[PDB]
Amino acid sequence: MHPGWPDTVGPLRVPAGVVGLRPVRMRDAAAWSRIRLADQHHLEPWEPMTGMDWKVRHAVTSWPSICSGLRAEARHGRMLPFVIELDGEFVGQLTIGNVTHGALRSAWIGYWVASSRTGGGIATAALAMGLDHCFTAVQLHRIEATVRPENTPSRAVLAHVGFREEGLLKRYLEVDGAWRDHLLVAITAEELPQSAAHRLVAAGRAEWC
Numbered sequence: 674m675h676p677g678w679p680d681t682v683g684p685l686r687v688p689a690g691v692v693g694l695r696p697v698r699m700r701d702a703a704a705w706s707r708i709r710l711a712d713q714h715h716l717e718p719w720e721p722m723t724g725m726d727w728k729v730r731h732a733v734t735s736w737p738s739i740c741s742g743l744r745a746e747a748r749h750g751r752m753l754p755f756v757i758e759l760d761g762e763f764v765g766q767l768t769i770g771n772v773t774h775g776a777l778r779s780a781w782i783g784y785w786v787a788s789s790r791t792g793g794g795i796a797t798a799a800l801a802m803g804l805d806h807c808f809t810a811v812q813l814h815r816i817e818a819t820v821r822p823e824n825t826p827s828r829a830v831l832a833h834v835g836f837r838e839e840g841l842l843k844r845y846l847e848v849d850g851a852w853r854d855h856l857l858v859a860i861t862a863e864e865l866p867q868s869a870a871h872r873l874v875a876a877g878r879a880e881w882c
């Protein structure tokens with residue numbers, strides 16, 4: 674029904690510290706709200722529009738309903754909603770979405786990291802260990818991601834792990850007040866001679882931990 678969920682993933686050491694993944698939970702409300710509120714202008718240009726004011730969307734009281742919905746999707750096997758931890762503390766999220774099995778065995782992957790912790794290899798490590806989990810525990814064959822061509826930092830993260838560009842999706846997602854083109858990138862399990870974590874370690878971008 675939902676292989677590889679729930680689970681913890683990692684840890685991996687990067688310059689910023691020790692990175693792991695674990696399920697969203699109700700007590701994340703305080704840290705999720707504090708960081709998303711404080712990071713509004715770093716996140717809003719790169720996030721799907723919600724049709725809500727940013728500050729009402731990200732109040733502490735908004736989290737239980739969001740967390741409940743994510744876990745409901747997860748127990749139906751359609752999502753894996755992880756929190757990125759740095760040294761045991763909430764610093765972002767890594768979400769595997771639109772999970773299918775059958776003859777497709779594919780999903781998309783998305784992420785964000787608190788701006789004060791960026792440039793330390795966290796998103797790259799989160800993505801690598803998320804991918805490795807999908808290609809083992811979740812029994813998936815393929816992971817895709819969509820990213821605005823303008824989102825040069827996220828494209829760097831995806832390139833670190835080996836994603837291939839597959840297409841350009843015109844007017845794909847409502848972001849920052851308009852329908853924006855998104856690149857489509859992908860990677861399949863048979864493209865990994867080595868795990869994504871192992872690839873990071875060999876490149877000097879992470880260490881075993």
Ligand SMILES: CC(=O)SCCNC(=O)CCNC(=O)[C@H](O)C(C)(C)COP(=O)(O)OP(=O)(O)OC[C@H]1O[C@@H](n2cnc3c(N)ncnc32)[C@H](O)[C@@H]1OP(=O)(O)O
Nearest residue numbers: 719783784785786791792793794795796797818825827829
């Ligand atoms: C598939 C998706 O989810 S698309 C949306 C991704 N999420 C967002 O854009 C939300 C807002 N931004 C963020 O959350 C973060 O800034 C992220 C997720 C993009 C990056 O998180 P980080 O922890 O800093 O990533 P990490 O350190 O592993 O790699 C970032 C790399 O991009 C580099 N980089 C940063 N800014 C730029 C830039 N303007 N141009 C080129 N490279 C850049 C960084 O230096 C780093 O590469 P390096 O170590 O070789 O120098």
